[PDB]
Amino acid sequence: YGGFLRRIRPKLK
């Protein structure tokens, strides 16, 4: 459950 922490750095995972 780490798919919209992309809100900063949207290619980090």
- For this PDB entry, the determination method is NMR
The answer to whether 13 and 4 have CB atoms below 8 angstroms apart is no
Residue whose pair of structure tokens reads 């780490």 in the numeric block: 2
Q: Are 10 and 2 in contact (CB under 8 A)?
A: no
Cα separation, 2 vs 10, in Å, equals 11
Q: What is the length of the chain?
A: 13
Distance CA 11, CA 7 (A): 10
